[PDB]
Each structure stands twice: as structure tokens, then as C-alpha cells.
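Regression test attached.
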Amino acid sequence: EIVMTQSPASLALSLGERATINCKSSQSVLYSSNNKNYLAWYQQKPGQPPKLLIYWASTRESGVPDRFSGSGSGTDFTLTISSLQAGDVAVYHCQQYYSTPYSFGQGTKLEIKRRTVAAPSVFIFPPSDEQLKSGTASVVCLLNNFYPREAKVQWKVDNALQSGNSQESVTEQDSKDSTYSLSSTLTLSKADYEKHKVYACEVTHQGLSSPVTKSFNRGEC
Amino acid sequence: QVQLVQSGAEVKKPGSSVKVSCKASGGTFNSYGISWVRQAPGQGLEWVGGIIPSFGTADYAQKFQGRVTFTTDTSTSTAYMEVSSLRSEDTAVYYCAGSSWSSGTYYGRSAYWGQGTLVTVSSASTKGPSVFPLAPSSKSTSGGTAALGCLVKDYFPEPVTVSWNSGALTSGVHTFPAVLQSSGLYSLSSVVTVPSSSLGTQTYICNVNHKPSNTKVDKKVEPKSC
Amino acid sequence: GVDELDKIDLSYETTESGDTAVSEDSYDKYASQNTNKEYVCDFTDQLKPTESGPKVKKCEVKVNEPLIKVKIICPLKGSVEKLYDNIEYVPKKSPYVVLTKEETKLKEKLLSKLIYGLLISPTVNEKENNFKEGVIEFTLPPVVHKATVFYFICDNSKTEDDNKKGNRGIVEVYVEPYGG
Ligand code: NA
């Protein structure tokens, strides 16, 4: 079996820079009777199937821009993305189809390093009355379109710091402004929710000069 | 406009068998090499095997010996992958892909990909989600921009898909990756930022699809007077 | 039917008889050895230096059914001491490049352009599918729409041993349309 290996595993570069992604096969994939390297490159954006970019190590698929360039021969191959754009954030995969079992590299995650930070806009959502009929209260704190990815979100219920009852989820880097977004969900029983008044999420992030609190009082509006 | 359309996600018991279909539109696959490629959570791509429907011949990765069968129905131009004796490790998105023929191989140009089928190997039962509004208000208003959304709670297995206004609203949408709760059920939310002045006159509806339970919900998210 | 990478030598030309001065009436023609859907031309006992040499040994591969694997074995130089020292195979890029007939001459062609959908894999049993490994192989598709005839040369006629000359081997693959 041919082992494929990519390096680096992850790449974070600024807009306009040149990305270089290497791929090595453990045996040669160059067939001497047609002088072809049996080597493909794919781009995979989150939620999507892989998309073929390069085949025969250097031939571009229809529609792929010329900034994407495959090179190399034998066992050593390189995908070069010139003049990096915000929409190029993806995982990039190399594959050999020289002989079965076909095999892939482990993938290279490419992200955009923004020069400047972006502060989140922060929103808080009380639990709906319809969720309270199911016996549970979810309180949602939304952090929209921030950079860098690192952020601290702390829940306070009647100014008591909460632990163990919240979960966060974070999007992939945005293909237009290279930011991230984040939700934190606090989960309480309806009975615990109705014993307390002030619900607050406090957000710490490099884009904010000091931590920001969004809050509501239960039953008030 | 060749298109590969796969069968829906399902949870399957450990030890059972799953059959995933992949139907080609834009004609037959009789000159195509079909590959099956899986992607486990957090992992790279892994070749399962391949079949050339013209030739009736199939190749398989050693890991799948005696467990995977590729078939085709040329009448309906549908390829099938059956995986038996399912293990927890078989939980993955399974893709079919097609490549046209060139230069003596059916696998030089795998440009056509199905959307993927998530097979979850678990004893836990299918559960459809409940959909709750994240209503816009003053505590969800910044400048002349408001945020609103839908909370999709307590489903199994993955995935749910969410659109807004039957796909007419795309700008400013964030649909978050699902979180596995301590209950062992998934939850996600989908949010969008809209103009605050739009809230009294424009209707916002999240369309939530959970194919494993045949759950289809449209939920209007209404403003508070707050 | 050709992509942007594939090239052949359009200057190259030869003939079936080559330099042997043997006319086509005098060829030793015989059928390939066919077991199930594998059709084999084995030249390991056909081309060694003989008294009457050079002779022309012409192996005929006749195809009119689906999924025939064609296999051609040409003895390597130095595989036997002395007896194949000047053996040559044509085309060097077989089976991807073959010879076809152009006005009594043999010229290079791409086999992929001749037969749509056939299998030419880069390796067979972990060895490169090229005559430098001594054997080539290709598999014909379920449906052939266009008739074709193409050639390979395995020539030992320039090997001499004890006042004997080796023989010139010819493969003629005749594909008739099938599967319509
Ligand atoms: Na002839």
C-alpha cells in the first residue's frame, strides 16, 4: 500500500500571501509508459464534499483559478496557492490513484490570519415560553463575527458564577471576513430557572477594551 | 450537470448492516469509476473501495474485507455500498464519488461527489428535535442590527439541516455545529443578523430538517415588543 | 480524445519484417494461448538463436468478446546468458503506446485513443506495467464500438550465438466490435 503524507498539518497565512502544501508518497506514482503522475488534490470546505482541484499532479479541473498550481513528480508533490483570498479557507487533501488501495494524505487545514482583531457583537436570548412547557430553560449568548477565535464567556445567575451547565459551539472561519462566531448555551430546569431573576453572560475578547455583560431579568422585558 | 445524490443519514445498531445508495443524474454511470470514501469525525479521508459498473469488478481496502459489498443497478443508475457487522468505529460520513475515463483508468478525475451520508453506529434510538425561537428584542439589538434564530433541541442521530425563508435568506446566517449534550442527544442553533427596522414587516422563518425522524418544521420567529 | 500531456513520436516508423528480409508469406503465424478471458503471447521459447534465423514469429490475438485481458511476455536482455543480448521491444512505452499500420508502415499510436474505456494500469502484481519488467497487460472494455488492429514488436534478430541468429517476434491484436 502507498502511504501518503502531507505537511504542514495546518497553515495560517495572511491575505495575498502564497500557501505551499507538500505531499509525499512512500513509492513513486509516476508511470513510465505515459509519463503521468497518478496524483490528485482536493479542496474541502466545511459541510461540503471534497472538490477536485488538480489531477495528474498538475492539471487543473474546469473552473479552478490559475492561483492554484500543482507541481512535483515521482514521490514529492506540492500544491501552491498564490495570492491567498478569504474564500480559500478549507482543508486540502492529496490522493494517489496509482494502485489499489487508493489512499489519501491526512489533510492540511488552511486558515486566514487577520492582521487586526474584530470584536464580537454580543446578543443574549431568554428561553422561549414554549421551551419552558417542556420543562427546560436554555439561555443563549451569541458572539457574532469576531477574530481571533479565543474568547471567554462566563454565565452569572443572580450574580453567581455558573459552572458545569453550559456548552459552547464555534463556527468555521468565515469565507468573507475571516471571522468566527460562537454560541454558549446555559441549560437549567424550568424549576431552577423560575427561582432566579438576573441572567447575564460576560464576554472577554481581545477586540473588547474590557469585558462586556449582556443581561436580562426573567419575566421583565 | 452530472449530479450524485445519496440516501439519507441513519442510525444503525452495532453488529447490523447498512446499505447506502448513490444515484447519478445527468445520465448513466456506465463509463464512470465509482469510489466510496468515508470521513470519521475529526479525521481525514479514507478510501473504502471502488467499483466500475461496466466491468462488474470491485476493489476494497483491507480494513473492510468480508464486510463491504459494492453493487450497481444499471437500470436506475444507482450504486450501492453495503457494510455489515457494523462497529462503533464505522461511524462516519460516507461519500460516493464518480470519475470519468481517461488514459486507461476510471479513477483519474473524481470530480463528481455525492453530498455524503452520515451513518451513526449506536444502540440509541432515533429522536426528532423540538424547534424553539430565539426571538429578537432590545437585548439582541446592536446599532440598527438585530439578531434572531432557532434553537433545535434534543435530536438523534446527526444531522439536522437549517435554512432561512426557504433559502432566500443566506447573508448573515450562522448555523452552529451541533453539540453532544450530557444526555447523549444533540442540539444546535442557527442565528441570523437582520436590520432592526425590518422586524415589524419582514417575516423570518427557519426551515428545520431532521431526515432520520422525517421531521420537517417551519418556525416563524417573532419579535418581542421589547 | 487526447489530453494535453500525452505525446508520441510521429517521426518513428518501422515495418513488420523490420531488417530480417523475411516476406509475409514466410511468417510463422500462430494463435495466442487463451485461458478463459486471458489471451497470452509468450515469446520466452520463440526467439532464441536458431539455425534458420532470423525467422518472424507472429502471435495473433483475435478478440470478439468482452473483458479480454491480453498479456505479452518478452524475454529480458540478460535473463539468459548471451541468448537475448540484443533483444529490443517496440514501443518502449507499451502498452500505452502501440504501433498501427499506415500505408504498409508501422507508426506509433495511443492505445487509449484506439479503444475507449480499456484498462491500462500502471502496475500489475506490484511490478510496473512496462516491457522493462518483461511483461505487459491490458484489459479490454465490455463494449467496443470501433474496430482496431495494433502491434507490438519483440525483436531478437540482432542477437547472434554460435553462427545462429535470434528471431523477430510480432504481436497482432485484432479487435472486432462487440457488445452493442
Ligand atoms: Na499488417
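Expected vs. actual: identical. The longest strand of chain B covers residues 145-155.
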